[PDB]
Amino acid sequence: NRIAILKYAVPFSEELLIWSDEAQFVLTASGTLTSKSVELNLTTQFDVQD
Amino acid sequence: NRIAILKYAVPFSEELLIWSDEAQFVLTASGTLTSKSVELNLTTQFDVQDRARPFGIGRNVYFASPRSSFTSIHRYYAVQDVSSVKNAEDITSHVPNYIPNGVFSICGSGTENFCSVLSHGDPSKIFMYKFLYLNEELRQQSWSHWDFG
Amino acid sequence: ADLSLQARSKLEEASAELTSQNMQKVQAIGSIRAAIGESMLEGSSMDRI
Amino acid sequence: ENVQVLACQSISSDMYVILRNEFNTFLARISFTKNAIDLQGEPYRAFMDM
Amino acid sequence: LNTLGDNGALGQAPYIHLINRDEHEQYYAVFTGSGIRVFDLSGNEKQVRYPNGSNYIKTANPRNDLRMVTVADYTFIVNRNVVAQKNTKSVNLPNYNPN
């Protein structure tokens, strides 16, 4: 619901963290990524800067 | 992402530990090994060296990390829950500068609760390390040496 | 001349079957390529499967 | 003074830092080993900064 | 360890990214404001040649505008300013009247 551009992404292992100015995301798939099971959740709301 | 050569592998039932310098691995399959499901995971990042002979008394593995002189022994506890691997902690923190340097063997007894490090820096001495593990809590660790003449 | 046309029909039935079997192939081979890549293991054995 | 630290980057056991003087640019490493001496000889692990 | 060069040999504000491929091969990919220099951790400078041109590195402030990832052997480099563009005049068939 808020047009947030994506600036930082840190891949760990089984989860990718997407960081946008005031909302943060986790990209986790389970098993293979595969597109069908790509998934994304809005975890935190803290502020990051450019 | 880092070309790591493989030096040490300590077989356990269920899991095999692969120890590159700067990267450590566990080879666990579940059921049969059966090529298909062989699996491998990057557990820990601690530093091992070429002459760091690892000898695993039980669940935990002791390996000597050579300094410029007076090596310091390190201990890594291979936990079945790969979630809690943490890192390899030093066991000669209280007694550094003690082992001479060139270590050619690490031997111990699980039943007798000790491991002996003998080094060619000072051939005569056998550096005893006696420990007493109680339900994963380190009750006592003692460093001493035996001089045979 | 009927059987000659009928031979062409069996060619088309075989041709349609090969495409249908080929659709499942690229899905199945493509899916395996996904897991071997993410398996971070590489080597000759994974090239074999 | 007048020294700019361009980049400090760390390998697992020691960190290699390259720093710029107003005349030169140098490469040097800071080693975090517990007791070991940095150079041969070196009676007591001297702290001479270069 | 060995001196890299003169004061101005590197950029005024360079982007420096350490490379760790092997226990034997370790480097520092420092980006001048225009151009690249690559030194080994021993201090020796390994010369860089720019086939296929450069003009991708040239940046007023390379610290902010460069994002790199060091894979096993070589590193991918993004200039944040440069906008990706589709290649016109490379069509599969120029006209190809279908009928």
Tab-separated table of C-alpha atoms in Angstrom:
chain	number	residue	atom	x	y	z
A	1	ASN	CA	0.000	0.000	0.000
A	2	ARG	CA	2.954	2.401	-0.001
A	3	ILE	CA	5.183	2.703	-3.061
A	4	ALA	CA	8.495	1.781	-1.440
A	5	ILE	CA	11.636	1.436	-3.521
A	6	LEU	CA	14.058	-1.338	-2.602
A	7	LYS	CA	17.622	-0.322	-1.716
A	8	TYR	CA	19.292	-3.065	0.269
A	9	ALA	CA	19.134	-6.815	0.150
A	10	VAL	CA	21.172	-9.251	2.248
A	11	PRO	CA	21.013	-12.981	1.417
A	12	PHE	CA	21.723	-15.311	4.260
A	13	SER	CA	20.847	-18.863	3.473
A	14	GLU	CA	17.138	-19.500	3.294
A	15	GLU	CA	15.882	-15.952	3.655
A	16	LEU	CA	16.445	-12.713	1.793
A	17	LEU	CA	15.928	-9.413	3.596
A	18	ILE	CA	14.553	-6.534	1.532
A	19	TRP	CA	15.011	-3.115	3.057
A	20	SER	CA	12.986	-0.148	1.972
A	21	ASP	CA	12.794	3.293	3.463
A	22	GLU	CA	10.157	2.532	6.061
A	23	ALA	CA	9.213	-1.115	5.662
A	24	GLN	CA	11.228	-4.317	5.628
A	25	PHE	CA	10.615	-7.617	3.904
A	26	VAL	CA	11.751	-11.237	4.098
A	27	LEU	CA	11.963	-13.377	0.954
A	28	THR	CA	11.751	-17.033	1.983
A	29	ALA	CA	10.596	-19.927	-0.167
A	30	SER	CA	10.897	-23.312	1.607
A	31	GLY	CA	12.365	-26.121	-0.458
A	32	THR	CA	13.360	-24.741	-3.834
A	33	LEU	CA	12.641	-21.052	-4.538
A	34	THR	CA	10.820	-21.897	-7.777
A	35	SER	CA	8.653	-18.746	-8.273
A	36	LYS	CA	5.482	-20.633	-7.362
A	37	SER	CA	6.679	-20.684	-3.779
A	38	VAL	CA	8.443	-17.355	-3.568
A	39	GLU	CA	6.578	-15.635	-0.696
A	40	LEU	CA	7.242	-12.276	0.955
A	41	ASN	CA	6.219	-10.843	4.302
A	42	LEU	CA	6.304	-7.352	5.814
A	43	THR	CA	8.196	-7.907	9.042
A	44	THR	CA	9.366	-4.572	10.460
A	45	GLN	CA	8.638	-0.884	9.922
A	46	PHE	CA	11.822	0.850	11.091
A	47	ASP	CA	13.491	3.597	9.077
A	48	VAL	CA	16.464	3.088	6.803
A	49	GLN	CA	18.098	5.793	4.703
A	50	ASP	CA	19.771	5.984	1.311
B	1	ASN	CA	31.828	-18.184	-2.994
B	2	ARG	CA	35.274	-18.891	-1.573
B	3	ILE	CA	37.411	-21.652	-3.068
B	4	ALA	CA	38.107	-23.608	0.115
B	5	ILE	CA	40.194	-26.759	-0.010
B	6	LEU	CA	39.163	-29.600	2.287
B	7	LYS	CA	41.692	-30.795	4.872
B	8	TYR	CA	39.962	-32.622	7.693
B	9	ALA	CA	36.923	-34.823	7.886
B	10	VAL	CA	35.740	-36.437	11.100
B	11	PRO	CA	33.181	-39.141	10.564
B	12	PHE	CA	30.296	-39.481	12.979
B	13	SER	CA	27.202	-41.533	12.403
B	14	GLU	CA	24.580	-39.232	10.878
B	15	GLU	CA	26.969	-36.359	10.102
B	16	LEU	CA	30.397	-35.807	8.588
B	17	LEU	CA	32.240	-32.621	9.405
B	18	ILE	CA	34.268	-31.012	6.621
B	19	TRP	CA	36.820	-28.480	7.801
B	20	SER	CA	38.223	-25.996	5.337
B	21	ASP	CA	40.204	-23.021	6.522
B	22	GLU	CA	37.613	-20.273	7.077
B	23	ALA	CA	34.541	-22.409	6.416
B	24	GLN	CA	33.090	-25.515	7.998
B	25	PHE	CA	30.599	-28.020	6.671
B	26	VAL	CA	28.372	-30.890	7.794
B	27	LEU	CA	27.473	-33.813	5.522
B	28	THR	CA	24.174	-35.262	6.739
B	29	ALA	CA	21.796	-37.270	4.581
B	30	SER	CA	18.851	-38.661	6.605
B	31	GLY	CA	17.942	-42.271	5.936
B	32	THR	CA	20.426	-43.677	3.454
B	33	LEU	CA	23.195	-41.473	2.083
B	34	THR	CA	21.961	-42.471	-1.406
B	35	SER	CA	23.677	-39.785	-3.524
B	36	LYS	CA	20.381	-37.940	-4.190
B	37	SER	CA	19.867	-36.795	-0.592
B	38	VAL	CA	23.402	-36.149	0.591
B	39	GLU	CA	23.091	-32.464	1.570
B	40	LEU	CA	25.689	-30.028	2.908
B	41	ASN	CA	25.509	-26.904	5.041
B	42	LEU	CA	27.892	-24.101	6.027
B	43	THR	CA	27.815	-24.247	9.808
B	44	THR	CA	30.746	-22.286	11.239
B	45	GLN	CA	33.364	-19.827	10.005
B	46	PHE	CA	36.220	-20.275	12.487
B	47	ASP	CA	39.826	-20.638	11.355
B	48	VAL	CA	41.610	-23.956	11.072
B	49	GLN	CA	45.178	-24.368	9.850
B	50	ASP	CA	47.101	-26.929	7.827
B	51	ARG	CA	48.945	-28.415	10.815
B	52	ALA	CA	45.927	-28.242	13.169
B	53	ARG	CA	45.517	-31.948	13.822
B	54	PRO	CA	41.935	-32.438	15.070
B	55	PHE	CA	41.165	-35.366	17.378
B	56	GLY	CA	37.557	-35.637	18.513
B	57	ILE	CA	37.223	-37.311	21.893
B	58	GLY	CA	33.414	-37.369	21.822
B	59	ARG	CA	30.883	-34.930	20.435
B	60	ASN	CA	33.629	-32.293	20.684
B	61	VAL	CA	36.858	-31.963	18.690
B	62	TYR	CA	40.205	-30.548	19.843
B	63	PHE	CA	42.622	-28.985	17.351
B	64	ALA	CA	45.816	-27.018	17.911
B	65	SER	CA	45.965	-23.541	16.379
B	66	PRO	CA	49.631	-22.546	15.957
B	67	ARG	CA	50.608	-18.988	16.811
B	68	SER	CA	54.012	-17.482	15.964
B	69	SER	CA	55.211	-19.554	18.902
B	70	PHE	CA	53.466	-21.311	21.782
B	71	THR	CA	50.374	-22.730	20.094
B	72	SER	CA	46.949	-22.532	21.734
B	73	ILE	CA	44.620	-25.533	21.695
B	74	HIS	CA	41.063	-24.986	20.465
B	75	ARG	CA	37.886	-26.978	21.128
B	76	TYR	CA	34.816	-27.252	18.902
B	77	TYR	CA	31.699	-29.039	20.137
B	78	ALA	CA	29.815	-30.657	17.253
B	79	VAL	CA	26.196	-30.426	18.336
B	80	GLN	CA	23.549	-32.530	16.659
B	81	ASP	CA	21.254	-29.511	16.529
B	82	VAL	CA	23.013	-27.615	13.758
B	83	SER	CA	21.075	-24.576	14.930
B	84	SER	CA	23.320	-24.096	17.983
B	85	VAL	CA	26.782	-24.680	16.473
B	86	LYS	CA	28.093	-21.342	17.884
B	87	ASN	CA	31.905	-21.354	17.436
B	88	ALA	CA	35.102	-23.092	18.556
B	89	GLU	CA	36.246	-21.708	21.899
B	90	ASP	CA	39.831	-21.663	23.129
B	91	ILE	CA	40.757	-23.922	26.051
B	92	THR	CA	44.225	-22.472	26.721
B	93	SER	CA	43.005	-18.949	27.478
B	94	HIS	CA	44.100	-19.253	31.108
B	95	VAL	CA	47.364	-20.931	30.119
B	96	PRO	CA	48.789	-19.455	26.890
B	97	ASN	CA	52.530	-19.502	26.029
B	98	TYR	CA	52.459	-23.053	27.406
B	99	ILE	CA	52.559	-25.611	24.565
B	100	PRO	CA	55.913	-25.188	22.757
B	101	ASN	CA	54.709	-25.061	19.127
B	102	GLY	CA	55.036	-27.947	16.683
B	103	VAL	CA	52.320	-30.414	17.700
B	104	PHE	CA	52.396	-33.814	16.005
B	105	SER	CA	49.661	-35.657	17.915
B	106	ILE	CA	46.626	-35.078	20.121
B	107	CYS	CA	45.437	-38.127	22.071
B	108	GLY	CA	42.779	-38.534	24.736
B	109	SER	CA	40.460	-40.918	26.542
B	110	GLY	CA	36.723	-40.357	26.683
B	111	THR	CA	36.349	-42.707	29.644
B	112	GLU	CA	39.238	-41.230	31.632
B	113	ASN	CA	38.265	-37.618	30.781
B	114	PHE	CA	41.511	-36.129	29.484
B	115	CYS	CA	43.377	-35.368	26.276
B	116	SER	CA	47.167	-35.269	25.963
B	117	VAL	CA	48.984	-32.937	23.570
B	118	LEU	CA	52.608	-33.818	22.844
B	119	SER	CA	54.733	-31.417	20.815
B	120	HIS	CA	58.179	-31.646	19.262
B	121	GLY	CA	59.014	-28.129	20.426
B	122	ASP	CA	59.837	-29.751	23.804
B	123	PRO	CA	59.853	-33.582	23.166
B	124	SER	CA	60.060	-34.702	26.788
B	125	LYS	CA	56.803	-33.259	28.097
B	126	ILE	CA	53.300	-34.663	27.627
B	127	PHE	CA	50.856	-31.800	28.102
B	128	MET	CA	47.912	-33.260	29.985
B	129	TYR	CA	44.507	-31.603	29.775
B	130	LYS	CA	41.968	-33.101	32.166
B	131	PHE	CA	38.315	-32.082	31.929
B	132	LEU	CA	35.085	-33.098	33.671
B	133	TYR	CA	31.949	-32.558	31.617
B	134	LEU	CA	28.668	-32.742	33.530
B	135	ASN	CA	25.484	-32.661	31.383
B	136	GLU	CA	27.118	-30.273	28.857
B	137	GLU	CA	28.479	-28.018	31.636
B	138	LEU	CA	32.269	-27.727	31.922
B	139	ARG	CA	32.869	-28.339	35.613
B	140	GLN	CA	36.671	-28.310	35.587
B	141	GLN	CA	39.533	-27.937	33.118
B	142	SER	CA	43.159	-28.356	34.154
B	143	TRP	CA	46.360	-27.963	32.155
B	144	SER	CA	49.557	-29.672	33.278
B	145	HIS	CA	52.452	-31.606	31.803
B	146	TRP	CA	54.358	-34.818	32.465
B	147	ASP	CA	58.155	-34.806	32.280
B	148	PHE	CA	59.689	-38.242	31.762
B	149	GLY	CA	63.293	-37.103	32.154
C	1	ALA	CA	-4.300	-45.395	-50.186
C	2	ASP	CA	-6.376	-45.579	-47.006
C	3	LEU	CA	-3.575	-47.232	-45.043
C	4	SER	CA	-1.093	-44.717	-46.455
C	5	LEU	CA	-3.258	-41.944	-45.026
C	6	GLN	CA	-3.628	-44.086	-41.900
C	7	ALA	CA	0.162	-44.342	-41.682
C	8	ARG	CA	0.289	-40.543	-41.729
C	9	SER	CA	-2.288	-40.474	-38.931
C	10	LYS	CA	-0.168	-42.785	-36.772
C	11	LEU	CA	2.785	-40.510	-37.510
C	12	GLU	CA	0.743	-37.614	-36.144
C	13	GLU	CA	-0.332	-39.574	-33.085
C	14	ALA	CA	3.294	-40.458	-32.363
C	15	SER	CA	4.295	-36.851	-33.048
C	16	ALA	CA	1.648	-35.529	-30.655
C	17	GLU	CA	2.730	-38.025	-27.990
C	18	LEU	CA	6.376	-36.989	-28.310
C	19	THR	CA	5.500	-33.322	-27.791
C	20	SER	CA	3.324	-34.202	-24.794
C	21	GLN	CA	6.099	-36.357	-23.339
C	22	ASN	CA	8.507	-33.537	-24.168
C	23	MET	CA	6.446	-31.040	-22.172
C	24	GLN	CA	6.806	-33.184	-19.056
C	25	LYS	CA	10.516	-33.635	-19.754
C	26	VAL	CA	11.456	-29.952	-19.671
C	27	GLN	CA	9.328	-29.444	-16.564
C	28	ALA	CA	10.956	-32.433	-14.854
C	29	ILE	CA	14.497	-31.705	-16.046
C	30	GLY	CA	13.995	-28.003	-15.393
C	31	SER	CA	12.836	-28.700	-11.845
C	32	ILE	CA	15.852	-30.914	-11.113
C	33	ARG	CA	18.157	-28.191	-12.432
C	34	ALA	CA	16.655	-25.917	-9.775
C	35	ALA	CA	17.485	-28.148	-6.800
C	36	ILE	CA	20.981	-29.115	-7.965
C	37	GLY	CA	21.831	-25.437	-8.340
C	38	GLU	CA	20.512	-24.612	-4.875
C	39	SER	CA	22.050	-27.745	-3.346
C	40	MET	CA	25.416	-25.872	-3.227
C	41	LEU	CA	27.143	-29.242	-3.754
C	42	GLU	CA	28.056	-29.495	-7.460
C	43	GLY	CA	30.438	-32.233	-8.590
C	44	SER	CA	30.235	-35.269	-10.820
C	45	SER	CA	27.515	-37.049	-8.840
C	46	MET	CA	25.018	-34.200	-9.235
C	47	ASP	CA	25.832	-34.032	-12.940
C	48	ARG	CA	25.034	-37.750	-13.054
C	49	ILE	CA	21.566	-37.639	-11.491
D	1	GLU	CA	47.481	13.524	11.671
D	2	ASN	CA	46.844	14.288	7.978
D	3	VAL	CA	46.374	10.510	7.552
D	4	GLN	CA	43.178	9.301	5.876
D	5	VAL	CA	42.003	5.711	6.344
D	6	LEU	CA	40.642	4.683	2.951
D	7	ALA	CA	39.435	1.181	3.801
D	8	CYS	CA	39.717	-1.271	6.676
D	9	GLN	CA	38.824	-4.810	5.616
D	10	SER	CA	39.153	-7.901	7.755
D	11	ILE	CA	40.073	-11.477	6.958
D	12	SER	CA	38.900	-13.820	9.708
D	13	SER	CA	42.032	-13.596	11.868
D	14	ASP	CA	43.534	-10.237	10.831
D	15	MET	CA	42.483	-7.025	9.095
D	16	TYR	CA	44.279	-5.356	6.188
D	17	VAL	CA	43.948	-1.563	6.181
D	18	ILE	CA	45.186	0.799	3.470
D	19	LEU	CA	45.719	4.395	4.548
D	20	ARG	CA	46.819	7.567	2.787
D	21	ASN	CA	49.475	10.023	3.911
D	22	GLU	CA	49.672	13.466	2.329
D	23	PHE	CA	52.644	12.097	0.378
D	24	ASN	CA	51.904	8.391	-0.081
D	25	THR	CA	49.373	5.582	0.106
D	26	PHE	CA	50.304	2.505	2.135
D	27	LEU	CA	49.067	-1.035	2.649
D	28	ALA	CA	49.363	-2.506	6.138
D	29	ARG	CA	47.735	-5.213	8.248
D	30	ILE	CA	46.518	-5.188	11.848
D	31	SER	CA	46.731	-8.686	13.336
D	32	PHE	CA	44.494	-9.601	16.269
D	33	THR	CA	46.336	-12.734	17.426
D	34	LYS	CA	46.383	-13.113	21.189
D	35	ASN	CA	50.101	-13.212	21.996
D	36	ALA	CA	52.049	-14.032	18.840
D	37	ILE	CA	54.742	-11.621	17.667
D	38	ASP	CA	54.238	-10.014	14.268
D	39	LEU	CA	57.835	-10.226	13.003
D	40	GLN	CA	60.794	-12.538	13.497
D	41	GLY	CA	63.026	-11.484	16.339
D	42	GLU	CA	60.859	-8.811	17.943
D	43	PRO	CA	61.519	-9.374	21.652
D	44	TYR	CA	58.120	-8.299	23.011
D	45	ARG	CA	55.587	-7.563	20.234
D	46	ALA	CA	56.468	-3.905	19.790
D	47	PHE	CA	53.752	-1.358	18.978
D	48	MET	CA	55.437	0.837	16.386
D	49	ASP	CA	52.430	1.457	14.071
D	50	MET	CA	54.488	0.597	10.944
E	1	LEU	CA	53.338	-3.914	3.756
E	2	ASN	CA	54.274	-2.463	0.375
E	3	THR	CA	53.258	1.117	-0.397
E	4	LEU	CA	50.529	1.305	-3.001
E	5	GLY	CA	51.809	4.449	-4.695
E	6	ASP	CA	51.664	8.222	-4.626
E	7	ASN	CA	49.045	10.086	-2.600
E	8	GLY	CA	46.941	10.674	-5.710
E	9	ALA	CA	47.481	7.180	-7.108
E	10	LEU	CA	44.086	6.144	-5.801
E	11	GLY	CA	41.008	8.289	-6.147
E	12	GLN	CA	40.269	11.224	-3.902
E	13	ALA	CA	37.265	9.249	-2.617
E	14	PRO	CA	37.683	5.648	-3.831
E	15	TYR	CA	35.511	2.554	-3.382
E	16	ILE	CA	37.613	-0.298	-2.002
E	17	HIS	CA	36.361	-3.881	-1.809
E	18	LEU	CA	38.506	-6.767	-0.601
E	19	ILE	CA	38.538	-9.956	-2.678
E	20	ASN	CA	38.965	-13.362	-1.004
E	21	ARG	CA	38.963	-16.116	-3.624
E	22	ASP	CA	41.476	-18.554	-2.161
E	23	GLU	CA	43.902	-19.088	0.686
E	24	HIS	CA	46.529	-18.034	-1.861
E	25	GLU	CA	44.677	-15.405	-3.939
E	26	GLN	CA	43.494	-12.340	-1.999
E	27	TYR	CA	43.134	-8.821	-3.336
E	28	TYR	CA	41.772	-5.309	-2.955
E	29	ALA	CA	39.572	-3.926	-5.823
E	30	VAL	CA	39.936	-0.179	-5.258
E	31	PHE	CA	37.987	2.035	-7.647
E	32	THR	CA	39.434	5.401	-8.538
E	33	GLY	CA	36.901	8.048	-9.500
E	34	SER	CA	37.855	7.016	-13.042
E	35	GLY	CA	39.412	3.586	-13.489
E	36	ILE	CA	40.341	0.611	-11.338
E	37	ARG	CA	43.476	-0.485	-9.503
E	38	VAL	CA	43.882	-3.943	-7.997
E	39	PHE	CA	46.566	-4.794	-5.457
E	40	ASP	CA	47.400	-8.111	-3.857
E	41	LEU	CA	47.506	-8.215	-0.070
E	42	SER	CA	51.276	-8.557	-0.420
E	43	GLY	CA	51.172	-5.029	-1.848
E	44	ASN	CA	52.056	-6.007	-5.414
E	45	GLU	CA	49.839	-4.340	-8.004
E	46	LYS	CA	48.147	-6.615	-10.525
E	47	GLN	CA	47.500	-4.597	-13.665
E	48	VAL	CA	43.937	-4.275	-14.962
E	49	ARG	CA	43.115	-4.075	-18.663
E	50	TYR	CA	39.745	-2.765	-19.782
E	51	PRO	CA	38.544	-4.689	-22.763
E	52	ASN	CA	35.066	-3.659	-23.845
E	53	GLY	CA	35.826	-0.199	-22.590
E	54	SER	CA	35.152	1.324	-19.229
E	55	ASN	CA	32.999	4.429	-18.822
E	56	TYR	CA	31.013	2.243	-16.446
E	57	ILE	CA	33.378	2.881	-13.531
E	58	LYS	CA	33.805	6.612	-14.157
E	59	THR	CA	31.836	8.235	-11.348
E	60	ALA	CA	32.041	11.474	-9.390
E	61	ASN	CA	31.638	9.640	-6.059
E	62	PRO	CA	32.343	5.910	-6.517
E	63	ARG	CA	31.814	5.259	-2.805
E	64	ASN	CA	28.059	5.823	-3.038
E	65	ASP	CA	27.402	4.624	-6.573
E	66	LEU	CA	29.168	1.235	-6.744
E	67	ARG	CA	27.713	-2.035	-5.432
E	68	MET	CA	29.776	-5.202	-5.833
E	69	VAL	CA	29.556	-8.879	-4.914
E	70	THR	CA	32.676	-11.063	-4.920
E	71	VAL	CA	31.793	-14.568	-6.045
E	72	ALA	CA	34.368	-17.375	-6.066
E	73	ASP	CA	36.440	-16.053	-8.962
E	74	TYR	CA	35.153	-12.691	-10.161
E	75	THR	CA	33.053	-9.784	-8.978
E	76	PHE	CA	29.899	-8.263	-10.423
E	77	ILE	CA	29.809	-4.465	-10.413
E	78	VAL	CA	26.793	-2.143	-10.629
E	79	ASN	CA	26.912	1.583	-11.236
E	80	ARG	CA	23.779	2.854	-9.503
E	81	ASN	CA	23.522	5.888	-11.783
E	82	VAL	CA	23.610	4.019	-15.089
E	83	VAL	CA	20.116	3.131	-16.299
E	84	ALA	CA	19.759	-0.190	-18.102
E	85	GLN	CA	18.568	0.199	-21.690
E	86	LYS	CA	17.114	-2.233	-24.204
E	87	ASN	CA	19.218	-2.764	-27.330
E	88	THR	CA	17.247	-1.480	-30.292
E	89	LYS	CA	18.349	-2.395	-33.870
E	90	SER	CA	19.182	-5.947	-32.716
E	91	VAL	CA	15.834	-7.482	-33.685
E	92	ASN	CA	15.545	-11.208	-34.363
E	93	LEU	CA	14.159	-10.741	-37.886
E	94	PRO	CA	14.182	-7.183	-39.289
E	95	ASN	CA	10.735	-7.209	-40.902
E	96	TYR	CA	9.783	-10.802	-41.765
E	97	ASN	CA	6.429	-10.297	-43.460
E	98	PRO	CA	4.704	-13.342	-41.916
E	99	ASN	CA	2.263	-14.013	-44.752
